[PDB]
Design a protein around this nucleic acid. Sequence first.
DNA 1: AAGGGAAAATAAACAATACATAACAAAACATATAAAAACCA
Lengths: 494, 106, 460
Amino acid sequence: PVIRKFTKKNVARAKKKYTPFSKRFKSIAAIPDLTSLPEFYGNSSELMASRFENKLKTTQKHQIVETIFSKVKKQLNSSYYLPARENEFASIYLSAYSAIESDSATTIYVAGTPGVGKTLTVREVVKELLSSSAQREIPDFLYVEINGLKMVKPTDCYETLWNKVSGERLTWAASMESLEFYFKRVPKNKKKTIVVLLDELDAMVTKSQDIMYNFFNWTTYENAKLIVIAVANTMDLPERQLGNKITSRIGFTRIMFTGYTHEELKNIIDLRLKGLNDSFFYVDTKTGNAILIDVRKVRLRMSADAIEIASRKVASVSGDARRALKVCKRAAEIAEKHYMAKHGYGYDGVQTVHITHVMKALNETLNSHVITFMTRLSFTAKLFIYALLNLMKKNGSQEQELGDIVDEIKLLIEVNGSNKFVMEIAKTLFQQGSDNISEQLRIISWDFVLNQLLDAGILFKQTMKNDRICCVKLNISVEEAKRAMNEDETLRNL
Amino acid sequence: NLNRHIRMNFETFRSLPTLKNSIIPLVATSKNFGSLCTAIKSCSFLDIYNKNQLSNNLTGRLQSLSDLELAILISAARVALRAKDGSFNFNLAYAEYEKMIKAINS
Amino acid sequence: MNVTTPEVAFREYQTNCLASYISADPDITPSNLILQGYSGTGKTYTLKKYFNANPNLHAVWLEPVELVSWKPLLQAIARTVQYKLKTLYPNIPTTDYDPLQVEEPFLLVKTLHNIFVQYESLQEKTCLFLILDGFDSLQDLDAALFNKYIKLNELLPKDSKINIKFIYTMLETSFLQRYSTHCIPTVMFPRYNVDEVSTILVMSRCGELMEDSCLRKRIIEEQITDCTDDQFQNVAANFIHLIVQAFHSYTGNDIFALNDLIDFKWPKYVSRITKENIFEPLALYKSAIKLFLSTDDNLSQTYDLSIISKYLLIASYICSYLEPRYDASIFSRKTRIIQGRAAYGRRKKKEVNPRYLQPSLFAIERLLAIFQAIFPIQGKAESGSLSALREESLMKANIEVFQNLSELHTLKLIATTMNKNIDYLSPKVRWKVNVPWEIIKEISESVHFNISDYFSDIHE
DNA sequence: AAGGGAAAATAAACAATACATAACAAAACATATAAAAACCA
Ligand SMILES: Nc1ncnc2c1ncn2[C@@H]1O[C@H](COP(=O)(O)OP(=O)(O)OP(O)(O)=S)[C@@H](O)[C@H]1O
Ligand SMILES: Nc1ncnc2c1ncn2[C@@H]1O[C@H](COP(=O)(O)OP(=O)(O)OP(O)(O)=S)[C@@H](O)[C@H]1O
Ligand SMILES: [Mg+2]
Ligand SMILES: [Mg+2]
């Protein structure tokens, strides 16, 4: 053939049609009743989604030990009736019950900081009104999860929504014309109400904001039976992206979920422990396996002030329910490994999770490690920081020339030549120990420890090929660098 | 001598994979057990190894220069010290070169 | 081990380490190895001489200097690995994967995973050495590419029968110090001595200086047929010791600059030998003295510019190194009808000599003012009062002055400030000359213009 | 011919602007393949 200027030998193209839905029935009066039609609304798709359960199955299982603390960690998982979002349940459920019962269309906007129960309680709204629809007090509907961070492209939401509505695989430019003809032209007698959840709406609108307009404008149509529950993080995402006249035309509700208080965290943690706290297990003393009601009848209480200080500390910072369920899951496995080490069960009178297990689980996520990292570096790496801290108090310029650091390291071994530690190390730091190596310009492992501190994130270095005039910041603080160097014995005396 | 080379690693690098690359040709380049028992007593290879690793860094390149290459490097280092920005040309560093060779021959 | 160490001349430490890291057993070989040295330091010599003395361990030689981007470097790895293994194991049935199909660093890993699983019927663990010879000489190189080749060993299967091993060759030691914390073994190739360059250059080139026809032809044709090979070898060896001892201070510890100064000066050294010159070496050096004093590594007027293009670089060189403040004191000549004071000139000399410094920017109208200040008299007066009024003896800027100023800009003899699509026709665009002093001095002596007097009064 | 004295020059501190390049965007230039669409047959 022709000689190609470059090759693309890894193109894999999807079998997706190009013609939209507005061109396959030739008339609005020739559109059939779409609810009594086989390939719409997912009436045959329940075979392929259940195919992949058989791939991760294997037949070997040899008596895995399920101890006392393994049952508590299973019950504090986020995947395992919700107490502290009651007015927010009653706002989303009331707005969606009215629009389904009246064959109307609306949009519900819900925002908040991460982890506050909003993806959970929207799914609990639509599960309540699936059960209300299955009892035939509202008509049947179809429910679509759209997650913006579960998409490769932002434009894949058009493909996935129209695939769930119609069972047809089209491209995205053909899917939005298929959906737009579906919502404004197809009559209300032929359609079914659709409750789509646009989850994590921040991620879809970062580049071109053409995607948030379409889902909200489709709900203003008369013939459309579409309820967009749009859950995002910030409250001003509609008004910044769309504008003021567009967000007033749509007329959507606007809910914000405040992060939970410390008393609400206690009624989440202790709600997921009602079946196990203050309860009796059957533990055999030779394997360690516990069984809820050779064997002792042990029992399990968790301390209420341990849940208190796990709630007071988490809710004061962010207030999310994930960080409190995994600070009590982390405390439950700290208590397990000491139970596992005392009796030595391994893997195949009363147990408790103290205040000291929860504090240990909570301190390790709040401590920094840049103190502990820098006290245990080399003498060479600590001499690099100690020379950099002297330069930031001769000038305070907070980005030092790298050749000013080298001359400071040489001056600091110059002046402290009476020191007992510096006399014996300056032979092993300029000639590297023995003779036959000349006295040199950089200290031994200068390229090692400069790259060790850049890789660790402690140190920032600009991009210059002149290795002497290049500039060097810190990235941690001047205080916690000085705190780590006033601990080391040999540097604080010199 | 082997515990002396461990102590230099602890003060400078403090990484056992760096000492691990030093011991590997101390063992592989030993012909018999009489030389392999001797070479870890003396550790005379680790001085030869550490000399190599650092033999063309910036001191080992300066010691591998001829006389004109050293004279131009000095001449550009005197113009870079008088300049406020540490900068120089080929014209500035040959001007300092030729007035240096005049003052030697004078 | 079970390996053979060759005898390379001045690399006896480097070959013992090279035999220490490279072996046939894949358990005792590192998956990365750098051979760092500068140019001409003999590190592809002893890398090649090590693999020739060890034929039963396998190598793939790639040059990353003729591959220019990262994507042809991945494709050549996939091409030459499977082409090596087809010659190496012809009895294995294989299906050829297109090396042009890799377009990612992962698609190399997937292709190498597919190539290596079909040699799984081999009897023992085998290592293939992938020699990236000049990895730093890749033109589009960045900091994040060498740590993409360090980690390929961890993505390829651990219990394969073919374990690819990377041997890198690199130059400049600022590239190497970016990867110091990876602790991967490195063998350094330092620069040679003056005595190591001379011994290497005399064992490399005395063979070719005999089989050269110029020494071959002359000795039979000059009718001095009284010589042996041991004089033939000693006359060429003493030339090499004499071509180093003259030009070592110019070249340094190079090998490739010495190899050029030999063969540029060996046809000129042969043609000055006769009967008294083969036997005595001191007599031949004084009869060939004029080719051991000047290197001559170079190949009417410097430019064929127009006569007004030639005065318009001169005026460009004046505007860009003289200051605008002092121009009225130097160039003004005309009598004053109206009272006024001329410019006084520079009061004291500056000891910077601005011709050493980078040229400064000027405007287009100052150039055309100094152009007609220095341009010679056109339309000379023919002693006629009828002719003297009409003459306009001083030259205005016609269509040719701007055409030659624009041609002087396309030839990169006048520069501007660098913006993409500069407009000539704008107030903001300034101009500067970029020719050295040694060119504008050759230009000024052609038109008999004394440009040195304009710069003698400033410092010289 | 002397001389006054204003133009010109020098210097130094400071402010305002230009410049070189980094980072990127976007249009021209280029290829690939499944679906439409002609189109013989
Ligand atoms: N009120 C609650 N009652 C019980 N469990 C809760 C409650 N709120 C959150 N959880 C648990 O914590 C998890 C947090 O999920 P959500 O908070 O709904 O996610 P989220 O609000 O979308 O946070 P994002 O995705 O970062 S915006 C849920 O899956 C539950 O397991
Ligand atoms: N020790 C040596 N003994 C004999 N010949 C040598 C020796 N070292 C170098 N040479 C020769 O001198 C030349 C040096 O070339 P190379 O070894 O290819 O240089 P290099 O180390 O690869 O540097 P670059 O990066 O390729 S320019 C070749 O012609 C070698 O044959
Ligand atoms: Mg969520
Ligand atoms: Mg080479």
